[PDB]
Structure formats: C-alpha cells, structure tokens
Design a protein around this nucleic acid. Structure first.
Ligand SMILES: [K+]
Ligand SMILES: [K+]
Ligand SMILES: [Mg+2]
Ligand SMILES: [Mg+2]
Length: 135
RNA sequence: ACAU
DNA sequence: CGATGT
C-alpha cells in the first residue's frame, strides 16, 4: 500500500541477458548510492538481482541496520527466501565468476542470520525502483 | 499469467 | 523482438 521510505532499494543492470551484469543499492528516500558492484562479464538478470539482495543483507547487517530491502524481482526474492538460486545458466569457464559469486552468496545465507524484511517493490503502483539503471 |  | 525466472 504505502512505500516504506526508510529502506534500501536494489536493482540489477545488464548489457545482454545473459550478458554483462552489475548491481547497486540506494537509499530509497534520497537515491544516494550506497554500494555498486563492479561489472561481471557474463551473468543473468536473475543472478544479479539475487546478488544485489544478498549484498544488501550483508551491508545492512554490518551496519546494524534494521531497514527493509526493496527488490522488484519476484524471482530473486524467492531465491533469497529459499537460500537457493535456481539459475538455468550453464556452468562453464566463461560463467565461472558469476557462479562463484552466486555460490558464495548462498553460502553466506546458509551461515548467517538476519531479520531484514525483503519487500516487493510495486512497480505497477509506484514507478521504477529507485535503484533502477534507466536502461 | 506474473515478475524481471 | 529476445532471454531469465515462478
Ligand atoms: K534499466
Ligand atoms: K516468459
Ligand atoms: Mg530489477
Ligand atoms: Mg531496473
């Protein structure tokens, strides 16, 4: 119903899908960019959306912040809930880096705890998520 | 169909 | 138009 303005918003950006993947997290209220991942040469949109949420969890935990995270990705939200990223992306030499990061993100989820609510950004009602790349 |  | 996902 109402945007929770005291929150962190994350989004993926890509050049191709599969293709070059990056992501960032912003303060929902102000748009201040709080973290940005160096582009990863090959990955999928959903792997990037997943990594963005997990990075947000790690970022907020490190700072003792109870803010929720907004993502517009039905898929990534579920993968985080399950602690399992069910990507179809072939595992080969060119996808090794993204798969290492995804594997490590799952490993972090399976060895840490958090209460952070992971909320669906309602793009149909609210417009684009504040972390959007505009591409 | 819905979310990207 | 194509691809990633539930
Ligand atoms: K965009
Ligand atoms: K589809
Ligand atoms: Mg998105
Ligand atoms: Mg976007």
């Amino acid at each position: 119903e109402e945007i929770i303005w005291e929150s962190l918003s994350v989004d993926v950006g890509s050049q191709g899908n599969p293709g070059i993947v990056e992501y960032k997290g912003v303060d929902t209220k102000t748009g201040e960019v709080l973290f940005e991942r160096e582009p990863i040469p090959i990955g999928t949109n959903n792997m990037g959306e997943f990594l963005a949420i997990v990075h947000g969890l790690r970022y907020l935990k490190e700072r003792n912040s109870r803010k929720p995270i907004y993502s517009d990705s039905q898929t990534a939200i579920k993968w985080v809930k399950d602690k399992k990223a069910k990507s179809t992306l072939v595992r080969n030499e060119e996808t090794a880096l993204i798969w290492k990061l995804v594997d490590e993100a799952e490993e972090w989820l399976n060895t840490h705890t958090y209460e952070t609510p992971i909320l669906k950004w309602q793009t149909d009602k609210w417009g684009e998520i504040k972390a959007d790349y505009g591409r």
